[PDB]
Structure 1
Amino acid sequence: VDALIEVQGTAIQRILYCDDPVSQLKCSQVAFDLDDGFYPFSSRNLLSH
């Protein structure tokens, strides 16, 4: 599974899964928090394969 990683002098913490569309968004901005505003996003094209 893909997720963000923190390393604190050979100590990891603060891990959040990227198993969600808007989480994958936050994952895209690799920021634990993001400011409000305008952001360009792709269309959800993960319906069928």
Structure 2
Amino acid sequence: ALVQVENTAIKKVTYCNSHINNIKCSQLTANLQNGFYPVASSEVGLVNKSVVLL
């Protein structure tokens, strides 16, 4: 999560649980200015294995 701290005290906790929240956590801010942001198309997991040898 992205946590804001003032005088060693938590003020705001943004969880990186959605795509927009992922962008917010990547930009280190919970208020995003209008614009274009680089992201990943998707996430890869649980794939098969291929082995090719001589």
Tell me if TM exceeds 0.5: yes
The one of 8, 25, 34 equivalent to 1:27 is 25
Q: Distance in 1 between matches of 2:33 and 2:14?
A: 18
Measure how far apart 1:21 and its partner are. Answer: 2.2
Bigger relative CO (Cα 8 Å, ≥ 6 apart): 1
Over the aligned positions, Cα root-mean-square deviation in angstroms equals 1.5
Q: Distance in 2 between matches of 1:18 and 1:39?
A: 16
Measure how far apart 1:22 and its partner are. Answer: 2.1
Equivalenced residue count is: 46
What is the identity percentage for the equivalent residue pairs of Structure 1 and Structure 2? 39
Structure 1 residue ranges, 4+ long, deviating more than 6 angstroms after superposition: none
Higher strand share: 2
Normalising by structure 1, report the TM-score. 0.70
Q: Distance in 2 between matches of 1:17 and 1:29?
A: 13
Tell which structure's C-alpha radius of gyration is larger: 2
Normalising by structure 2, report the TM-score. 0.66
Give 5+ residue unaligned stretches, structure 1.
Answer: none
Aligned to 2:51: none
Q: Distance in 2 between matches of 1:28 and 1:15?
A: 14
